[PDB]
Fold this protein.
Amino acid sequence: ANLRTQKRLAASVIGVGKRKVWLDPNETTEIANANSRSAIRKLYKNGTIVKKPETVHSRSRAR
Amino acid sequence: SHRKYEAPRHGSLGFLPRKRAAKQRGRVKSFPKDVKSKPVALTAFLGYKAGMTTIVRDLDRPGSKMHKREVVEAATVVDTPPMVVVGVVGYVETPRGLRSLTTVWAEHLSEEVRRRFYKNWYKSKKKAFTKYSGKYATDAKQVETELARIKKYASVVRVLAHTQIKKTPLSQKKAHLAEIQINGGSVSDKVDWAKEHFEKEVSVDSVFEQDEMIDVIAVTKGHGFEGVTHRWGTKKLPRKTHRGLRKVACIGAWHPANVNWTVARAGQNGYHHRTSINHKVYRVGKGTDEANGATEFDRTKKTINPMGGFVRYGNVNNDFVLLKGSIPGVKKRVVTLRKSLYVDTSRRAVEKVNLKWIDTASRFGKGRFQTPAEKHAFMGTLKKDL
Amino acid sequence: LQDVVTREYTINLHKRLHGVNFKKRAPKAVKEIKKFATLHMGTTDVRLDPKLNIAIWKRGVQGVENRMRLRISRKRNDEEDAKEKLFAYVEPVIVPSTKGLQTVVVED
Amino acid sequence: VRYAATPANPAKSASARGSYLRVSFKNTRETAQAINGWKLEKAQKYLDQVLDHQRAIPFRRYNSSIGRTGQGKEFGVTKARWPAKSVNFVKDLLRNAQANAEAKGLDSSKLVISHIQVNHAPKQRRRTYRAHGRINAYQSTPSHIELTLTEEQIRLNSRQRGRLASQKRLTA
RNA sequence: UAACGAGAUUCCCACUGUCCCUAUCUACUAUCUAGCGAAACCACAGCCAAGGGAACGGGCUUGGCAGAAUCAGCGGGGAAAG
RNA sequence: UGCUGUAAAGCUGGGUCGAACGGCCUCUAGUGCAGAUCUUGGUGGUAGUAGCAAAUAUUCAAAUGAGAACUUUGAAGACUGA
RNA sequence: GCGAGAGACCGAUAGCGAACAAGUACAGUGAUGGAAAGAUGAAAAGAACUUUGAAAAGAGAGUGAAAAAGUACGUGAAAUUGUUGAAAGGGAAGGGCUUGAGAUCAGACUUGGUACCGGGCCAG
Ligand SMILES: CN[C@@H]1[C@@H](O)[C@@H](O[C@@H]2[C@@H](O)[C@H](O[C@H]3O[C@H]([C@@H](C)O)[C@@H](O)[C@H](O)[C@H]3N)[C@@H](N)C[C@H]2N)OC[C@]1(C)O
């Protein structure tokens, strides 16, 4: 119910900013149990945590 | 020391205090002085301000540069359905002023005037005047004794009358009830005329004729709290004035050590009671006339209402009075029309006006057509017309 | 009285947002829709679907559409000691034009 | 503990207290006076309507330069206000006193608020910073609240005696 | 004395709400509410006119008068505060 | 609650309270407060008043919880703009 | 400095600055500057248990000679404040003098003497 640490750990493990980390809204309890980086990796592999895609910056008008 | 230079006072000391009027309906302070030898008549009439328009006229003032020439003039429309007489009041002279002796009411009161006696009509049992009505049903002898009292003792007789507000487009359902003084004839004649008009309608054309000069009593447009610059027209202080410039810089000398009543101060502006005189009647139109807005020279089959309706009022579907110029009040405001308090013999008072044309283009914008038919003729067929 | 009922409405948000501070237009549209749902369903307990919130904010803080087609349903609220026996659920309606649409009872 | 007022019949009464409550003394005094001497149930209903801004608390002493409202017409005033925190503290104390009365067997619908008062509690100090490097006080003005619920010769001269004897002998 | 100057000054062109003469609009305040909550200052206090008086009184003398509780403003007075 | 004295003051009834204290003859002094912009501490009126307005901006739902404008998660709208 | 005995001395704003974890806490770059603060009760017997409350707490109960001693603790003044009762109130209030009204207080049937004697007070 306070997933601030899990968000920070996922950002570190996945290799993105915190702004690109998606924590499953429907899986709050299991994410709350993920205290180690190892558990964060497991949740990342299962898809419970997801890397959001980058916001497009197209160069088509520039070209 | 004296003022370095002279200037007239800002604002008039005769319209004080600049406070909110006590009632929204404007009251008639004074009625025309009674002349016994005239026919019995009403001296006032209540209507509703509908809006303004433009007319064209030929001027008849010899010696004027515009003599025998067309002039364009602003004019005001007052929606004036007939009033209903519902009662009579007798006043006796006393060394302390006029005192009302008794009030006599008609047998039946319409729902719109009986709504006037209620703050919460929908939650009430509607008992107003229900026991009074039984003073007629038995034999009306008590009513006639009261009227005999008025004949014996009163020196001033006024009728109680109300507007038929449901003939206007107003969403207000309460009628406006007022005392209108009866002038002419003896007191007995006044009481008889009041009695024969109980429950009856009296029309505007019986009080006011065309070319008459009449007075308007109404409460002005409200503006709320106002500063001295606009409330009193004082000079704006220079641009570089610390703490602001819409002020009166000196509000008094050291002595007297009190702010004087004559100094301009910030306060409530507008919503004042005003009695404006000498507004000429340009037309007394009729509600049944389907060419209210037509003249001898402009023969178009046309009502007084502008295309689209009067803005924020509606359509004038009753008898109306077209008055020269502007009158106090806003749209929808109940206005009291009064006969002149004096005899006027000047040209402007005795001129007979003959209207050439009355404008009926939209008041909601830059109206450029007088009629839907003219609009269609100018623009031709449109897509929505197929 | 049909306590449980679903109807579809048009709300004229343009006249309700007239003169409103530009950074409060979308937040005030939220408040206007809540007030609109109480005027028709008689319930102060009004819940807005998050898809409605997305539709309100689609064009930014001052980009609210002039008219929105809403589906409002009054529903029971067991939730004892709630002060409200019913509540109104407000959700958007995808339509090609939000013009010329009358209030319609929805047969679920 | 000693209450400022002791019930006439303690068997038909129930009290409650709150000390050192961090709620405005002035708002609490006005809210306590607004229900002083009322039936308990009437007072609870009224406080709930105050919280909903349907009725207001009349401010009669601590009211200088507060606003004016039409909800004061009920009480003959123009200055009234809706202090939620004071209302909540007073409601909690009324609830506690009702619980105490129920434990003593008293009937809730008969209970009237026969005593209620607010006293100053010691102030809590904070600090506020002023222009030109000055420090001023920023204190709280807390409250002591307490309340109680309660179930609802002519001897005569010689001449006077002689006069009455004579008058009695006259009328039989 | 060319050049230079946030230096002082006069006139001209352009320009304009500086002005004639003001009006209207926006945001934030003020305003009302929930919560929070200071300070300056304070003999006692607080309606006027005249008198006399430390020769310009809130109080004293003689008059005018005088009706609870108040809110937003205001800058005459408190020979206001610092 | 009263009594005595012109007075400075003295005595007494009732309540509160818990460990020492007074009359008389004398001795002695760091011995009597309204003021000193007195000292230290405490407390008011002011006053629920001034005010809590720079730095574009927040919204819906769920979770948690006695309690959520302010916590967490999701959706979104924004900004810093290397 | 070390060891003793005393006083017509002071009695917690006094007496050393300090009666207490006082040259402490804290301030200042530094030299230096430098407070406030003693007392439940004989004994913690420091309130078990029930109940309302999210809780702090309340209400019962309990201990105690006392809770009018509850670690906000000996007594517990004043300013200031709440409630209750009584009264007054047209641009201050307060004071003297006088009386009325309402409240309080007091006294001679005496330390009365033996139905009588005799006295006290207010009056004609
Ligand atoms: C727990 N708070 C402590 C508290 O112990 C406080 O003690 C006072 C204490 O000194 C008082 O006691 C006092 O007793 C007398 C007399 C005036 O009562 C004083 O002369 C004496 O200095 C003092 N002991 C006592 N009556 C109340 C406690 N709060 O001392 C300071 C403090 C921080 O407030």
In short: The helical segments of chain A are 4-14, 28-32, 37-46. Chains A and D do not touch (no CB pair under 8 Å).
